[PDB]
Amino acid sequence: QIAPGQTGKIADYNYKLPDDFTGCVIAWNSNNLDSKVGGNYNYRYRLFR
Protein backbone atom coordinates (compact mmCIF):
# COMPACT_ATOMS: atom_id res chain seq x y z
CA GLN A 1 0.00 0.00 0.00
CA ILE A 2 3.04 2.33 -0.07
CA ALA A 3 3.05 4.06 -3.47
CA PRO A 4 1.54 7.15 -5.14
CA GLY A 5 -2.22 6.94 -5.52
CA GLN A 6 -2.71 3.94 -3.23
CA THR A 7 -5.71 3.58 -0.93
CA GLY A 8 -5.78 1.87 2.45
CA LYS A 9 -5.42 2.27 6.18
CA ILE A 10 -1.73 3.11 5.61
CA ALA A 11 -1.92 5.73 2.86
CA ASP A 12 -5.10 7.12 4.45
CA TYR A 13 -4.00 7.32 8.10
CA ASN A 14 -0.46 6.84 9.37
CA TYR A 15 1.81 7.42 6.36
CA LYS A 16 1.00 8.74 2.88
CA LEU A 17 3.00 9.36 -0.33
CA PRO A 18 2.07 12.34 -2.55
CA ASP A 19 0.37 11.42 -5.81
CA ASP A 20 3.16 13.29 -7.64
CA PHE A 21 5.81 11.75 -5.36
CA THR A 22 9.15 11.00 -7.03
CA GLY A 23 11.40 8.60 -5.14
CA CYS A 24 12.34 5.01 -4.38
CA VAL A 25 10.27 2.71 -2.17
CA ILE A 26 12.46 0.22 -0.29
CA ALA A 27 11.57 -2.68 1.98
CA TRP A 28 13.40 -5.67 3.43
CA ASN A 29 12.56 -8.45 5.88
CA SER A 30 13.81 -7.92 9.44
CA ASN A 31 11.75 -10.84 10.80
CA ASN A 32 14.94 -12.50 12.07
CA LEU A 33 15.52 -9.47 14.34
CA ASP A 34 12.56 -7.15 14.92
CA SER A 35 10.29 -10.08 15.82
CA LYS A 36 10.46 -10.68 19.59
CA VAL A 37 8.43 -13.44 21.27
CA GLY A 38 4.78 -12.52 20.79
CA GLY A 39 5.09 -8.93 19.59
CA ASN A 40 7.15 -5.76 19.40
CA TYR A 41 5.43 -2.70 20.88
CA ASN A 42 8.20 -0.25 19.95
CA TYR A 43 6.50 0.11 16.53
CA ARG A 44 2.97 1.52 16.71
CA TYR A 45 0.53 2.99 14.20
CA ARG A 46 -2.65 5.06 14.00
CA LEU A 47 -5.50 2.63 13.33
CA PHE A 48 -8.42 5.10 13.24
CA ARG A 49 -8.57 8.73 12.11
Binding site: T7, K9, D12, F48
Partner: protein, 49 residues
Protein backbone atom coordinates in the same frame (compact mmCIF):
# COMPACT_ATOMS: atom_id res chain seq x y z
CA UNK B 1 -34.77 1.37 -3.00
CA UNK B 2 -32.48 1.60 0.02
CA UNK B 3 -29.53 3.52 1.47
CA UNK B 4 -26.01 2.25 0.76
CA UNK B 5 -23.57 3.20 3.54
CA UNK B 6 -19.99 2.39 2.52
CA UNK B 7 -18.33 4.24 5.43
CA UNK B 8 -18.65 1.13 7.62
CA UNK B 9 -16.03 -0.60 5.47
CA UNK B 10 -13.35 1.98 6.28
CA UNK B 11 -14.38 2.38 9.93
CA UNK B 12 -14.26 -1.40 10.52
CA UNK B 13 -11.78 -3.36 8.41
CA UNK B 14 -13.48 -6.33 6.76
CA UNK B 15 -12.56 -6.91 3.11
CA UNK B 16 -9.10 -8.39 2.61
CA UNK B 17 -9.09 -7.66 -1.15
CA UNK B 18 -11.05 -4.58 -2.25
CA UNK B 19 -10.64 -2.99 -5.68
CA UNK B 20 -12.77 -1.10 -8.21
CA UNK B 21 -12.04 -1.24 -11.94
CA UNK B 22 -14.79 1.07 -13.18
CA UNK B 23 -14.93 3.67 -10.40
CA UNK B 24 -12.96 4.92 -7.37
CA UNK B 25 -13.07 2.91 -4.12
CA UNK B 26 -13.55 5.91 -1.81
CA UNK B 27 -16.09 7.75 -4.00
CA UNK B 28 -18.71 4.98 -3.89
CA UNK B 29 -20.35 6.81 -0.97
CA UNK B 30 -20.32 10.31 -2.49
CA UNK B 31 -21.54 9.06 -5.88
CA UNK B 32 -24.59 6.78 -6.05
CA UNK B 33 -26.02 4.61 -8.82
CA UNK B 34 -29.48 3.50 -9.91
CA UNK B 35 -29.52 -0.32 -9.95
CA UNK B 36 -26.98 -2.46 -8.08
CA UNK B 37 -26.36 -6.09 -9.05
CA UNK B 38 -24.20 -8.27 -6.79
CA UNK B 39 -23.02 -11.70 -7.98
CA UNK B 40 -21.96 -13.77 -4.97
CA UNK B 41 -19.93 -16.96 -5.41
CA UNK B 42 -16.81 -18.82 -4.27
CA UNK B 43 -13.76 -19.88 -6.29
CA UNK B 44 -10.29 -21.32 -5.80
CA UNK B 45 -7.48 -19.00 -4.78
CA UNK B 46 -5.51 -19.05 -8.03
CA UNK B 47 -8.75 -18.61 -10.02
CA UNK B 48 -9.36 -15.08 -8.68
CA UNK B 49 -7.02 -13.19 -11.02
Amino acid sequence: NCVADYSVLYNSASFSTFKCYGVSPTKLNDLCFTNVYADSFVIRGDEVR
